[PDB]
Amino acid sequence: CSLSPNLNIPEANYSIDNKLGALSWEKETNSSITKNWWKDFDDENLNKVVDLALKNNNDLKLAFIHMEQAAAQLGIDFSSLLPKFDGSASGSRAKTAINAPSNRTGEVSYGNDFKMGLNLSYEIDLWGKYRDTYRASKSGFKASEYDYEAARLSVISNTVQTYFNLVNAYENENALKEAYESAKEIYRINDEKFQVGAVGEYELAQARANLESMALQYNEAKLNKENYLKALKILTSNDLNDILYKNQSYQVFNLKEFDIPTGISSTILLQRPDIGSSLEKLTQQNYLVGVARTAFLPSLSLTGLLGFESGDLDTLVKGGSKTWNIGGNFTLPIFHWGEIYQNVNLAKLNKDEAFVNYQNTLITAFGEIRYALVARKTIRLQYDNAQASEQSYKRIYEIAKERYDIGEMSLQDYLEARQNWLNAAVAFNNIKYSYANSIVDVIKAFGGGFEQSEDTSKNIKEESKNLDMSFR
Amino acid sequence: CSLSPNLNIPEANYSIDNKLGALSWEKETNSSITKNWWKDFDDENLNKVVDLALKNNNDLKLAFIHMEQAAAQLGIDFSSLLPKFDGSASGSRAKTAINAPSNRTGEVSYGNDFKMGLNLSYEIDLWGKYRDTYRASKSGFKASEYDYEAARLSVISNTVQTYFNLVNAYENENALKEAYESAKEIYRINDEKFQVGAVGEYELAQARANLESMALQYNEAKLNKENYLKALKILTSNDLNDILYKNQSYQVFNLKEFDIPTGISSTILLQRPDIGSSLEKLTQQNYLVGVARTAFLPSLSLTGLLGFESGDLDTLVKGGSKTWNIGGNFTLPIFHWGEIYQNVNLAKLNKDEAFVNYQNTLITAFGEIRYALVARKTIRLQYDNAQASEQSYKRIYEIAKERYDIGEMSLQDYLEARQNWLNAAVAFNNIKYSYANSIVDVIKAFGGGFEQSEDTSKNIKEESKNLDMSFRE
Amino acid sequence: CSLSPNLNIPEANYSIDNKLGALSWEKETNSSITKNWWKDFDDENLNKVVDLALKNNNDLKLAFIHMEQAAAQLGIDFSSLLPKFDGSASGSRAKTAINAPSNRTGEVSYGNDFKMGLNLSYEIDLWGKYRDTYRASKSGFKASEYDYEAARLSVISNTVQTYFNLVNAYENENALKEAYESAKEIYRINDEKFQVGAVGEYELAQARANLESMALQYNEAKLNKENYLKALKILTSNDLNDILYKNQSYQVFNLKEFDIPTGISSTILLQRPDIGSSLEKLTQQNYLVGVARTAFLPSLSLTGLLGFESGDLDTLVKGGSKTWNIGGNFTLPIFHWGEIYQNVNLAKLNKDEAFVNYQNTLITAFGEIRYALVARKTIRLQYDNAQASEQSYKRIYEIAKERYDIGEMSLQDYLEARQNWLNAAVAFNNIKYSYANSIVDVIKAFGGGFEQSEDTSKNIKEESKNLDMSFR
Ligand SMILES: CCCCCCCCOCCOCCOCCOCCO
Ligand SMILES: CCCCCCCCOCCOCCOCCOCCO
Ligand SMILES: CCCCCCCCOCCOCCOCCOCCO
Ligand SMILES: CCCCCCCCOCCOCCOCCOCCO
Ligand SMILES: CCCCCCCCOCCOCCOCCOCCO
Ligand SMILES: CCCCCCCCOCCOCCOCCOCCO
Ligand SMILES: CCCCCCCCOCCOCCOCCOCCO
Ligand SMILES: CCCCCCCCOCCOCCOCCOCCO
Ligand SMILES: CCCCCCCCOCCOCCOCCOCCO
Ligand SMILES: CCCCCCCCOCCOCCOCCOCCO
Ligand SMILES: CCCCCCCCOCCOCCOCCOCCO
Ligand SMILES: CCCCCCCCOCCOCCOCCOCCO
Ligand SMILES: CCCCCCCCOCCOCCOCCOCCO
Ligand SMILES: CCCCCCCCOCCOCCOCCOCCO
Ligand SMILES: CCCCCCCCOCCOCCOCCOCCO
Ligand SMILES: CCCCCCCCOCCOCCOCCOCCO
Ligand SMILES: CCCCCCCCOCCOCCOCCOCCO
Ligand SMILES: CCCCCCCCOCCOCCOCCOCCO
């Protein structure tokens, strides 16, 4: 039987509300997430970049290895349920003393002892010490599977979000490229006018200050682009030359409708990998409580031998050397003065720690779901605000250029109008790809399509087809 | 009875100075910290959210469990100081070969052996191998207690500072709400004037750009508010609906004076939990050095049996089957070619590592104290600066509005003056609660009222009264 | 013999390109790095603070101890290759039952048994179980040496970059100090003029607003200074009073050319300590594969005794009590139902994990090298942009001050011109010391002068002469 205590996970009680992540003019959605959710961005550059991650990402490989390690440990603990067989052979020579109690000859005794045979050893699993040890590893392996799914979701999400940050950086670098192009022209015009006394030193300094400031901002954008370029290569590449010299082809993100949840699911506990992993790690420690409690109970051991024994090597495999034995041992602790009690206590405390870990995983998840839903619909508003702001500042700049060209506006006010448009355009870019990443955060928080009910082992094998483990 | 070396912790030598964190017009204070320092903010909402943390925080629960685990290991190692008693029963059958040296009959020998009785097993702790193993665990438990105190202070401080960051987020959001409302009114006016030809396309675009900019800044403030709301929920709540849908009632921080240190304490080593924890972990490793050195010395093992033995089961508990034995065994390593010597070295290096960890904890603590004190008084100055700045920019706005309404100021200049007030108002909010959190940092750096000399176990039990451990009850 | 598999590390294939980190008007360089590279900043204040770090930094001490611990473990595993010798002595008194099989006297038997002598125990390392255990620990020690070199490079680089961040903070605090002094006088003038009706409330408010704003920015700069002051103290100091009360003498960074790589080295694998560490940790796990595989093969044990035995303590060391024995024992597992096989799998997977760790180290390293090179040459361009920008905004301020003093410019146009100069000066400060730290990033990413071919143990001993281990 088994001494494992009944595992009582309290029900997660919460209300559903699909208006939580939906704007008033938006459709309330609780639809499920597709497994390959990233293809809904209609970006083939992104698709190829994700496939590179699912192939080359080392963190994902480590998670796969951790899973295999857990399976290997599972196999080891299963063997403990079966009787072990070993072969042995020995030879020895001894001078037995005259005063030795086993010596009745009154003389010095020289003798040999040669042995050879098969050995049987088996601990009778009466109280489920070895079954629950095995079942603990089984729970551990399932936890490693869920941890792998969590790692896959994390790697894919990080890859998508780094990609969009990179595109964000390309757009800002390009918007700052032209802003510097015109800054060169504007200065060159005022430089020509200064040589003929058409502008003063003050205005020329303003034109020059604008030129250098734009150049400084331009190079900052290049730097910011390089950072996310590096971050994407590290997540996806295995080619050292690609990492060193190559760049990344990309596609501008344009606003569209996304089939993502707008409220928390009724089966969220079965849809997040980390929750499932945390669950399995709890029952793992629960089985280990049973293992610890068997120490209070009697242990039964079976030993057997079949082979040969002789005082002479020449007669070792003779008929007169044939020997065997079989034995059962029954040991039972009486007073260990708290040793076993505190060990069971320690096992119970490890379960408590696993339970608290589970609760914290639950709290954090629900915290992530709340923010992700609110952030998505809030940034959605920002998309309209930043778009309209950029258009307004662009129109202001257009009128400013007209007035400046016919001397009806100072250079200072004209330069300010340019900067304001630049800021608005950059801000709109930042909002645009913050919204793209906000879609990912929602998908990430809801599990990315993971379902605990499905065949976890079969799903993992199918989705890990292209994982590069050629190294072994 | 012990091979543990003398533990020689060098003294921490430093000068005291109560002007380090005190302004020239401020009183230099070296008063101690009350256990529940957070109630001096006079915020009932803050008090409630701290109690929720002390009740529901899972990191606090983990720290409590880690302490209980250390107590359990302490109980395990205590048992090794006492003789163990076990019961045993066995039965075996054997075909002893003719050629077996033990066989004198010249014939195949079948025989049985049945045993049953009580067993004694006791390791004589001549050199304190098990005494120091116990003492190491005792120091490990004491370290877990100090780690719990450190975790408690950390959880409380984080909860308080998250609360204030949340209130800061509410204030900026509300300020940006009004800034958005009037900006919408500004555009509505300029939109009406446009259709009757009272304003140009240029001015209408400026009013619209201002409207969208404010709306963008507004939603950012909401987003920043939601971020700290989530942070507070995770720290204090065990209700999933509360986490998902509820908000947080709060109270604006008003500038008062707090009874906090302005200079480093003369007993700072006894007032920080992390220093005490780091200390106990050092003595723990020191005891383990002694344990490792006992391997060089002779070990003595005592065994005893009282029970029965017979070649037949039917006479197993008969009188002629009664038997007993008592045994002692000395073992002494002679040549192990560095095995034991390097194990002692390894144990001594573990102690060195714990010493370096202690030094680093000391250095970090003093660094935190310096910054916390200087930051507190510097941000105190910033409070007056940001308040006066906000008032000046507000008066500027009030005049700029009067002038714009009678057409004596361009819309652009008017929108700018208004944006400047908003910036100054937000900046003052940020300074206000950065000062509130600066108070906490000082309190945190000085241990939050912890005193090592007190009964830690009694204190821990008293202060963990409301800790929710009902999941195992 | 050994059962360790042949380790096959794939070649790191990549192209060289000295233009990667070189501007068009710079000389492309592939020159190696001097081991004390920080002295090329010509800063004596920086030199003393690095020496303090190399003496007092606790992370550096921990890495030194970790190396010593690995050395101790190596000594332990060396001993397992040699026969052990132990002394023993025992005494037992037993009432042997009448029914006991060994008792053929028909009556209760009381008897003693006393033993004393030297014991031999030796595991014949036929399959390299203990030799590869030893060789694994040796690789572990060499890995710890490289980890120390990596820690040394890390501590030094952090100390230098923290120093430059501190000087950046001091320079900005000084710039905001003088800006505060000017703002205090500007307000004082307007305050005087106000009470004689020479300026209005609107202008006075602008003067006060500018004054309080500068005061807020000034005190913020102090805070930023104190933060990097603390960070430097923790990295370098062991004196509590110094940490609490003292400040840091410094030296302004002046632009100069530095002899650093502009392209990736052809021997970068031998120049980065962290790569060498990952390599050694891989061979370590490789040797352990062999160790695990020895469990399949027969273990041979040698046992010996030389001493005494008697049923009487009075005759224990007499001639008739002299006894000895010698023996060999073979053990060979037959059926273990996966236990050993899965243990080998587990060991194989630990090697795979170490391989993935190595690969990830390579990818990260090449990513760091790419960014460090591009950042260096880009911030180099920014240096000229920020310098020219600051000088332009300074000239604008000078002309603006002239016009304001004769009433030909409004107060807030003059205050704006002041703030713009301050911003440009602070920005140029940030760029200046971001460039200094960009130099360090390049040196750091290239190993900081480390060469794997050199006598690692000799180098470590020589470069750690000032490491304060006086506590022991
Ligand atoms: C690596 C080598 C290990 C040691 C080998 C020692 C050499 C073996 O010597 C053999 C001696 O043989 C005699 C044994 O017994 C002799 C007396 O009694 C025999 C009974 O008739
Ligand atoms: C019919 C009566 C039952 C017993 C008769 C058994 C016949 C003989 O079986 C002997 C089998 O012995 C096994 C010997 O094992 C070899 C050990 O090798 C281990 C090597 O290191
Ligand atoms: C790994 C191999 C272990 C093999 C163990 C075999 C033990 C056999 O036990 C048999 C004893 O049970 C009762 C039978 O004894 C025979 C008595 O009569 C013999 C005929 O004269
Ligand atoms: C690894 C080595 C395994 C050796 C296995 C040996 C198996 C053979 O067993 C047969 C024994 O019987 C043979 C006959 O012997 C007759 C002896 O009679 C006289 C008394 O000793
Ligand atoms: C893994 C295989 C285990 C084999 C078990 C063998 C059990 C032996 O049975 C013994 C029964 O009784 C012993 C007498 O047998 C006949 C007497 O003479 C023949 C001896 O080989
Ligand atoms: C799963 C249970 C274990 C396997 C089956 C047990 C086999 C039963 O064997 C019983 C026969 O042996 C009886 C004892 O024989 C002793 C011979 O000597 C007689 C004189 O005392
Ligand atoms: C001169 C000395 C007096 C002799 C007194 C004899 C008392 C015998 O005590 C032996 C009891 O044996 C203990 C049984 O072991 C139990 C093992 O399994 C657990 C079952 O409950
Ligand atoms: C857990 C139970 C352990 C029981 C240990 C039993 C030890 C008792 O024996 C020790 C006494 O020493 C010898 C005394 O005998 C005296 C001689 O008696 C002979 C009478 O003719
Ligand atoms: C946990 C209980 C352990 C009990 C230990 C006591 C063992 C008794 O030892 C007695 C030693 O010698 C005295 C008795 O001698 C033998 C008894 O019969 C004598 C003649 O009638
Ligand atoms: C799978 C469970 C098998 C249980 C077997 C237990 C092993 C113990 O065997 C011991 C030997 O059996 C002895 C049989 O004969 C007993 C006779 O007792 C009185 C005669 O001297
Ligand atoms: C948990 C099991 C404990 C069993 C305790 C048994 C105690 C009873 O002891 C009885 C002793 O007296 C029996 C009388 O025997 C006299 C004849 O002996 C002759 C030799 O065989
Ligand atoms: C706490 C330690 C208590 C002492 C334990 C010592 C180990 C027990 O040894 C048992 C045997 O004692 C033998 C006593 O008599 C010895 C006489 O020797 C022969 C004289 O002719
Ligand atoms: C707490 C310390 C251990 C307890 C010691 C108990 C007292 C030991 O007494 C020892 C003296 O007795 C010597 C042996 O006596 C019996 C021998 O009988 C046969 C003599 O030839
Ligand atoms: C041909 C053989 C020559 C005879 C040589 C006899 C040498 C005997 O050596 C025995 C030495 O015994 C040492 C045992 O030490 C006891 C363990 O504990 C010691 C603590 O002080
Ligand atoms: C820790 C020390 C272990 C010492 C082991 C000693 C082993 C002795 O080996 C010698 C055995 O080899 C054969 C010797 O026998 C010769 C017979 O001579 C008898 C004289 O009449
Ligand atoms: C630690 C090294 C110890 C070495 C022990 C060597 C063992 C001695 O060799 C055994 C030789 O066997 C022959 C017996 O010797 C005769 C007995 O004493 C002399 C009487 O004639
Ligand atoms: C730490 C304790 C070590 C003890 C070592 C003891 C070694 C002494 O050996 C002495 C051997 O000489 C024996 C002399 O007497 C011989 C008597 O022979 C007569 C028959 O018994
Ligand atoms: C480092 C290698 C050491 C090798 C030792 C192996 C284990 C020792 O085994 C001893 C076996 O003794 C038997 C040999 O002597 C037999 C003599 O008989 C001869 C006449 O029948």
mmCIF file of C-alpha atoms in Angstrom, chain A residues 58-59 61-62 65-66 68-73 75-76 78-79 82-102 104 108 110 118 201-203 205-206 208-213 215-217 219-227 229-230 233-235 237-247 412 469 471-472, chain C residues 12-17 20 102 104-105 112-113 264 309-311 315 318 320-339 342-343 345-346 349-350 352-353 355-357 359-360 362-364 366-371 374-375 378-379 381-382 384-386 388-389 392-393 395-396 399-400 403 409 413 416-417 427 431:
data_model
loop_
_atom_site.group_PDB
_atom_site.id
_atom_site.type_symbol
_atom_site.label_atom_id
_atom_site.label_comp_id
_atom_site.label_asym_id
_atom_site.label_seq_id
_atom_site.Cartn_x
_atom_site.Cartn_y
_atom_site.Cartn_z
ATOM 1 C CA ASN A 58 19.923 27.148 -26.121
ATOM 2 C CA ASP A 59 17.570 27.844 -23.214
ATOM 3 C CA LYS A 61 17.469 22.965 -25.471
ATOM 4 C CA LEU A 62 18.336 23.067 -21.763
ATOM 5 C CA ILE A 65 17.558 18.185 -21.536
ATOM 6 C CA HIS A 66 16.082 18.820 -18.083
ATOM 7 C CA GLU A 68 15.186 13.965 -20.441
ATOM 8 C CA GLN A 69 17.088 14.026 -17.147
ATOM 9 C CA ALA A 70 13.798 13.732 -15.257
ATOM 10 C CA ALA A 71 12.848 10.746 -17.409
ATOM 11 C CA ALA A 72 16.192 9.077 -16.711
ATOM 12 C CA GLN A 73 15.660 9.561 -12.979
ATOM 13 C CA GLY A 75 13.760 4.958 -14.911
ATOM 14 C CA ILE A 76 16.237 4.600 -12.055
ATOM 15 C CA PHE A 78 11.371 2.224 -11.272
ATOM 16 C CA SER A 79 14.165 -0.347 -11.034
ATOM 17 C CA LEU A 82 12.320 -5.110 -8.849
ATOM 18 C CA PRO A 83 14.683 -7.696 -7.282
ATOM 19 C CA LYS A 84 18.356 -7.119 -8.105
ATOM 20 C CA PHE A 85 20.755 -9.818 -9.306
ATOM 21 C CA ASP A 86 24.545 -9.672 -9.017
ATOM 22 C CA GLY A 87 27.419 -12.044 -9.724
ATOM 23 C CA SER A 88 30.357 -12.419 -7.359
ATOM 24 C CA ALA A 89 33.645 -14.287 -7.012
ATOM 25 C CA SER A 90 36.221 -14.173 -4.229
ATOM 26 C CA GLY A 91 39.387 -15.811 -2.938
ATOM 27 C CA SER A 92 41.115 -15.367 0.407
ATOM 28 C CA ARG A 93 43.945 -16.812 2.495
ATOM 29 C CA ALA A 94 44.208 -16.420 6.261
ATOM 30 C CA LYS A 95 46.507 -17.366 9.109
ATOM 31 C CA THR A 96 44.048 -18.052 11.917
ATOM 32 C CA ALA A 97 45.599 -17.510 15.342
ATOM 33 C CA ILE A 98 45.886 -20.223 17.993
ATOM 34 C CA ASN A 99 44.051 -17.969 20.444
ATOM 35 C CA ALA A 100 41.252 -17.312 17.953
ATOM 36 C CA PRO A 101 37.931 -18.559 19.431
ATOM 37 C CA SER A 102 37.093 -20.306 16.144
ATOM 38 C CA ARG A 104 40.076 -25.531 18.415
ATOM 39 C CA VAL A 108 48.322 -22.165 13.884
ATOM 40 C CA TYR A 110 46.464 -21.678 7.412
ATOM 41 C CA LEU A 118 24.664 -15.380 -8.124
ATOM 42 C CA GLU A 201 25.653 84.674 -36.152
ATOM 43 C CA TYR A 202 22.789 83.925 -33.767
ATOM 44 C CA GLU A 203 20.659 82.210 -36.416
ATOM 45 C CA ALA A 205 24.419 78.982 -34.365
ATOM 46 C CA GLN A 206 20.813 77.841 -33.988
ATOM 47 C CA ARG A 208 24.302 74.443 -36.344
ATOM 48 C CA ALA A 209 23.043 73.489 -32.880
ATOM 49 C CA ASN A 210 20.063 71.823 -34.542
ATOM 50 C CA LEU A 211 22.350 69.951 -36.939
ATOM 51 C CA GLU A 212 24.622 68.546 -34.220
ATOM 52 C CA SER A 213 21.683 67.733 -31.943
ATOM 53 C CA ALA A 215 23.225 63.943 -35.442
ATOM 54 C CA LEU A 216 23.519 63.045 -31.758
ATOM 55 C CA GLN A 217 19.944 61.739 -31.708
ATOM 56 C CA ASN A 219 23.554 57.980 -33.625
ATOM 57 C CA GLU A 220 21.624 57.169 -30.440
ATOM 58 C CA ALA A 221 18.951 55.537 -32.587
ATOM 59 C CA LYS A 222 21.607 53.507 -34.392
ATOM 60 C CA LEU A 223 22.911 52.349 -31.019
ATOM 61 C CA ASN A 224 19.431 51.418 -29.806
ATOM 62 C CA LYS A 225 18.946 49.451 -33.021
ATOM 63 C CA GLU A 226 22.220 47.573 -32.553
ATOM 64 C CA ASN A 227 21.175 46.547 -29.037
ATOM 65 C CA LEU A 229 19.765 43.478 -33.269
ATOM 66 C CA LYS A 230 22.209 41.744 -30.934
ATOM 67 C CA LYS A 233 20.700 37.134 -32.863
ATOM 68 C CA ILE A 234 21.427 35.664 -29.425
ATOM 69 C CA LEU A 235 17.890 34.276 -29.200
ATOM 70 C CA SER A 237 21.193 32.249 -34.311
ATOM 71 C CA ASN A 238 23.805 29.484 -34.238
ATOM 72 C CA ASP A 239 25.928 30.953 -37.030
ATOM 73 C CA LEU A 240 28.834 32.999 -35.648
ATOM 74 C CA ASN A 241 29.101 35.033 -38.854
ATOM 75 C CA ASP A 242 25.369 35.765 -38.835
ATOM 76 C CA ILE A 243 25.743 36.962 -35.249
ATOM 77 C CA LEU A 244 28.755 39.122 -36.090
ATOM 78 C CA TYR A 245 27.937 40.767 -39.413
ATOM 79 C CA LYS A 246 24.419 40.042 -40.705
ATOM 80 C CA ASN A 247 21.333 42.178 -40.091
ATOM 81 C CA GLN A 412 13.764 79.153 -33.839
ATOM 82 C CA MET A 469 20.088 18.444 -30.963
ATOM 83 C CA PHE A 471 25.287 18.357 -31.304
ATOM 84 C CA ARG A 472 24.888 15.054 -29.508
ATOM 85 C CA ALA C 12 34.234 27.787 -34.225
ATOM 86 C CA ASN C 13 34.098 28.989 -37.825
ATOM 87 C CA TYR C 14 34.015 32.746 -38.425
ATOM 88 C CA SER C 15 35.541 35.404 -40.677
ATOM 89 C CA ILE C 16 37.862 38.187 -39.522
ATOM 90 C CA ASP C 17 37.140 41.859 -40.270
ATOM 91 C CA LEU C 20 33.842 46.240 -37.851
ATOM 92 C CA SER C 102 27.233 -22.550 16.280
ATOM 93 C CA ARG C 104 27.329 -27.701 19.923
ATOM 94 C CA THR C 105 28.189 -27.982 23.615
ATOM 95 C CA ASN C 112 34.980 -13.120 24.409
ATOM 96 C CA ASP C 113 36.604 -11.977 21.169
ATOM 97 C CA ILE C 264 37.298 40.074 -33.855
ATOM 98 C CA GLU C 309 42.889 -12.110 17.784
ATOM 99 C CA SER C 310 42.207 -13.827 21.108
ATOM 100 C CA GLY C 311 39.346 -14.974 23.325
ATOM 101 C CA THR C 315 47.050 -12.916 25.561
ATOM 102 C CA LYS C 318 51.197 -12.640 22.350
ATOM 103 C CA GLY C 320 49.745 -17.320 19.599
ATOM 104 C CA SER C 321 47.361 -14.496 18.728
ATOM 105 C CA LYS C 322 49.168 -13.304 15.593
ATOM 106 C CA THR C 323 46.926 -13.423 12.528
ATOM 107 C CA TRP C 324 46.652 -12.149 8.960
ATOM 108 C CA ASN C 325 44.561 -12.464 5.811
ATOM 109 C CA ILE C 326 44.496 -11.241 2.220
ATOM 110 C CA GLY C 327 41.670 -11.422 -0.304
ATOM 111 C CA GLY C 328 40.211 -10.255 -3.592
ATOM 112 C CA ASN C 329 36.527 -9.727 -4.342
ATOM 113 C CA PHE C 330 34.873 -9.487 -7.761
ATOM 114 C CA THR C 331 31.377 -8.029 -8.140
ATOM 115 C CA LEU C 332 29.461 -7.851 -11.425
ATOM 116 C CA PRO C 333 25.855 -6.629 -11.871
ATOM 117 C CA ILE C 334 23.618 -8.984 -13.855
ATOM 118 C CA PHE C 335 20.022 -7.743 -13.881
ATOM 119 C CA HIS C 336 19.386 -4.243 -12.605
ATOM 120 C CA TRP C 337 16.425 -3.438 -14.853
ATOM 121 C CA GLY C 338 17.649 -0.073 -16.123
ATOM 122 C CA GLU C 339 19.217 1.362 -12.957
ATOM 123 C CA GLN C 342 19.631 5.140 -16.914
ATOM 124 C CA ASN C 343 22.489 6.372 -14.730
ATOM 125 C CA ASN C 345 21.900 8.225 -19.705
ATOM 126 C CA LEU C 346 21.767 10.709 -16.831
ATOM 127 C CA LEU C 349 22.622 14.222 -20.431
ATOM 128 C CA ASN C 350 24.799 16.139 -17.965
ATOM 129 C CA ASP C 352 24.850 17.513 -23.227
ATOM 130 C CA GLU C 353 23.787 20.218 -20.777
ATOM 131 C CA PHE C 355 27.718 21.389 -24.182
ATOM 132 C CA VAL C 356 24.680 23.651 -24.544
ATOM 133 C CA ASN C 357 26.116 25.870 -21.807
ATOM 134 C CA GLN C 359 27.470 26.913 -27.048
ATOM 135 C CA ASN C 360 25.465 29.614 -25.270
ATOM 136 C CA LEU C 362 30.050 31.315 -27.520
ATOM 137 C CA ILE C 363 26.880 32.928 -28.879
ATOM 138 C CA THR C 364 26.746 35.490 -26.065
ATOM 139 C CA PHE C 366 30.183 36.950 -30.159
ATOM 140 C CA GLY C 367 27.088 39.054 -29.513
ATOM 141 C CA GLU C 368 28.949 41.129 -26.938
ATOM 142 C CA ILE C 369 31.921 41.545 -29.284
ATOM 143 C CA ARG C 370 29.642 42.809 -32.053
ATOM 144 C CA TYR C 371 27.858 45.365 -29.883
ATOM 145 C CA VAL C 374 29.793 49.092 -33.024
ATOM 146 C CA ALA C 375 29.022 51.035 -29.841
ATOM 147 C CA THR C 378 29.321 55.137 -32.783
ATOM 148 C CA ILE C 379 29.746 56.874 -29.419
ATOM 149 C CA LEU C 381 30.951 59.967 -33.505
ATOM 150 C CA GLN C 382 28.567 61.121 -30.774
ATOM 151 C CA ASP C 384 32.009 65.158 -31.824
ATOM 152 C CA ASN C 385 28.266 65.775 -32.100
ATOM 153 C CA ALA C 386 27.847 66.479 -28.383
ATOM 154 C CA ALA C 388 29.909 70.852 -31.242
ATOM 155 C CA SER C 389 26.316 71.008 -29.995
ATOM 156 C CA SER C 392 26.753 76.085 -30.325
ATOM 157 C CA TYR C 393 24.250 76.355 -27.471
ATOM 158 C CA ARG C 395 27.408 80.757 -28.177
ATOM 159 C CA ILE C 396 23.630 81.120 -28.401
ATOM 160 C CA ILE C 399 24.516 86.314 -27.549
ATOM 161 C CA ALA C 400 21.241 85.866 -25.655
ATOM 162 C CA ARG C 403 20.580 91.039 -25.723
ATOM 163 C CA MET C 409 15.265 89.877 -25.263
ATOM 164 C CA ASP C 413 13.811 83.523 -23.928
ATOM 165 C CA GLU C 416 15.423 79.014 -22.134
ATOM 166 C CA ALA C 417 18.769 79.803 -23.758
ATOM 167 C CA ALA C 427 24.654 65.587 -22.449
ATOM 168 C CA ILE C 431 28.547 61.027 -23.887
#
